[PDB]
Design a protein around this ligand. Structure first.
Ligand SMILES: CC(=O)N[C@H](C(=O)N[C@@H](Cc1ccccc1)[C@@H](O)CN(CC1CCCCC1)NC(=O)[C@@H](NC(C)=O)C(C)C)C(C)C
Lengths: 99, 99
């Protein structure tokens, strides 16, 4: 689809049999999901944002469907108030910025 | 133009007669640039993101050119790790996400 930016670009994603809301963020190198338990081992990691860093758990090879479009990659899980889909996943669905 | 996301979407902007690199960020509600003096009265403001809140200076009705497109709006200036063009100005230039 085409998504205007009048409001935050929040769309529906699906992880497992769970549907969630997530912000399409061209300003995120990574994908950060809200705290959830995923099976598998992870690696601790520190990601920075506008105000500093937060600690997250890194899981590799997670499948997320974005508006019916599948992407597989690294996801970081931390205490974020909103799911953020970053560039690692957006490139996979052929998402571009156009003006 | 159509911007792909294999790399950070950095573009050249012109503001205050200066050229600068900035990120087209759909995950940002506001536009935040690194410390710089701009003409006009500014007022203190706090904005937050991952890691915390930062103190910034708010300048209203600043003219900024993004890839040849003129935008006149609010620009926040403060300790941001990168120059960010948020939704407030991306809408003025007709920017959308597509996939
Ligand atoms: C290194 C990196 O890519 N960091 C991302 C990031 O924070 N991206 C920021 C912009 C950015 C890039 C590089 C360094 C520092 C900052 C942005 O795209 C997303 N954040 C996310 C906030 C937004 C609100 C929901 C919770 C997450 N946006 C902001 O920090 C903006 N805040 C708001 C409220 O819009 C701010 C720039 C105005 C994380 C989400 C992984």
């Amino acid at each position: 689809p085409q998504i205007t930016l009048w409001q935050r670009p929040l769309v529906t994603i699906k992880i497992g049999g769970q549907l969630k809301e997530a912000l399409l963020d061209t300003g995120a190198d990574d994908t950060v999901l809200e705290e959830m338990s995923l099976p598998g081992r992870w690696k601790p990691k520190m990601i920075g944002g506008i105000g500093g860093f937060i600690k997250v758990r890194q899981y590799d090879q997670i499948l997320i469907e974005i508006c019916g479009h599948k992407a597989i990659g690294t996801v970081l899980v931390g205490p974020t108030p909103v799911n953020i889909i970053g560039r690692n996943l957006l490139t996979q669905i052929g998402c571009t910025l156009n003006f």
